[PDB]
Amino acid sequence: RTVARDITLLECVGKGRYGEVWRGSWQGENVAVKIFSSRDEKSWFRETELYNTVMLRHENILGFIASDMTSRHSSTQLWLITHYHEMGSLYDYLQLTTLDTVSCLRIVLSIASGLAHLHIEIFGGKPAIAHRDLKSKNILVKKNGQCCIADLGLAVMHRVGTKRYMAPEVLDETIQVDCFDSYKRVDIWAFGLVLWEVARRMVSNGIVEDYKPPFYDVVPNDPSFEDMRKVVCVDQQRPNIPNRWFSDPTLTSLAKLMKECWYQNPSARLTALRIKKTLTKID
Numbered sequence: 001r002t003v004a005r006d007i008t009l010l011e012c013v014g015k016g017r018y019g020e021v022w023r024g025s026w027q028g029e030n031v032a033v034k035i036f037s038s039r040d041e042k043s044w045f046r047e048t049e050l051y052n053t054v055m056l057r058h059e060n061i062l063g064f065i066a067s068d069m070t071s072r073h074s075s076t077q078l079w080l081i082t083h084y085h086e087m088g089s090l091y092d093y094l095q096l097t098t099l100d101t102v103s104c105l106r107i108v109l110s111i112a113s114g115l116a117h118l119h120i121e122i123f124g125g126k127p128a129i130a131h132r133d134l135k136s137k138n139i140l141v142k143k144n145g146q147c148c149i150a151d152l153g154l155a156v157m158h159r160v161g162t163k164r165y166m167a168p169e170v171l172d173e174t175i176q177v178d179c180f181d182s183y184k185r186v187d188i189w190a191f192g193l194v195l196w197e198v199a200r201r202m203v204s205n206g207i208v209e210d211y212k213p214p215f216y217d218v219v220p221n222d223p224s225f226e227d228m229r230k231v232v233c234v235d236q237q238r239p240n241i242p243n244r245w246f247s248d249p250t251l252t253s254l255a256k257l258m259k260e261c262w263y264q265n266p267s268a269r270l271t272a273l274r275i276k277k278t279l280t281k282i283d
């Protein structure tokens with residue numbers, strides 16, 4: 001039989017220290033192709049090792065297609081091939097889109113659904129998985145209004161995370177590194193920050209906040225480890241909840257939920273399954 005492996009690379013949709021992401025075409029269908037830098041080869045290995053262990057399949061997890069290693073004259077080329085989401089990342093989408101109640105809840109419940117699926121151990125199934133780099137750039141928007149979680153290059157089964165989204169116990173190096181629940185709790189902190197980023201873009205009473213990243217008002221761009229530790233650990237700052245949210249029942253409920261993802265004590269934070277239940281009872 002013919003094994004068609006040619007992918008046409010049509011446009012670059014992302015370029016970074018990680019390498020590049022391309023929109024590609026295989027057999028007439030769009031695919032996304034991540035081409036890894038030498039800097040980030042271990043992220044290709046880790047995601048590939050995870051998918052060789054457990055073939056994750058969930059509506060709110062970016063869909064795996066292939067891991068390719070190709071020998072070159074003097075280098076190895078590493079590609080990860082996934083489903084393609086033409087609307088791009090949640091980070092992108094929130095810059096120039098505002099949300100209503102239904103769209104805001106659909107987005108955040110779909111993220112919670114993907115995250116709970118990663119976190120849960122299923123027997124007979126999947127190992128429990130923590131993401132370790134959850135953020136709005138690592139979430140893609142689908143045409144049906146749900147999102148999917150991407151980038152399992154730092155994931156752990158039972159490179160450091162983006163500093164702006166690191167939990168206090170990562171910044172103060174008290175995290176219990178031998179305890180898998182510790183990594184779930186780090187993802188929940190980051191989820192709370194994503195929930196704040198999305199909620200700001202939900203309109204109520206004709207008001208909306210501009211898109212801003214978490215801690216935009218207290219750290220520089222590309223904040224250092226120390227910059228983040230002083231904000232999150234020493235001063236114990238948390239993102240601002242605007243007064244206008246307290247006129248709106250949905251944003252009032254989402255403020256409470258994000259507070260319960262941001263406790264200093266990791267074991268006080270809500271679980272992804274409890275976040276899902278709370279979100280299903282809003283509106």
Ligand SMILES: COc1cc(-c2cncc(-c3ccc(C4CCN(C)CC4)cc3)c2C)cc(OC)c1OC
Nearest residue numbers: 001002003004005006007026031065066067068081
């Ligand atoms: C090697 O590399 C790539 C391969 C492919 C690809 C292309 N055509 C057909 C296939 C195929 C799938 C599955 C079987 C099964 C049939 C049932 N039988 C019991 C066992 C074998 C055979 C063939 C593949 C996997 C695409 C690629 O990119 C999209 C590849 O590069 C990453």
Ligand SMILES: COc1cc(-c2cncc(-c3ccc(C4CCN(C)CC4)cc3)c2C)cc(OC)c1OC
Nearest residue numbers: 003004026027029030031064065066067081082083
């Ligand atoms: C990697 O990705 C894609 C792959 C393919 C593809 C191409 N040739 C053959 C297959 C295949 C056929 C048959 C089995 C068997 C397995 C055992 N049992 C006996 C029943 C079923 C498995 C695999 C596939 C899945 C198509 C795709 O899209 C249309 C892919 O997605 C981009």
Ligand SMILES: COc1cc(-c2cncc(-c3ccc(C4CCN(C)CC4)cc3)c2C)cc(OC)c1OC
Nearest residue numbers: 013021032033034080082084085088137138150151
């Ligand atoms: C986060 O991480 C990964 C993401 C992806 C991925 C999947 N679908 C679509 C995209 C994408 C497409 C298009 C735009 C732009 C272009 C057109 N318009 C002007 C605005 C929107 C942005 C983004 C990506 C980047 C794949 C990955 O791996 C193959 C990723 O890594 C795991």
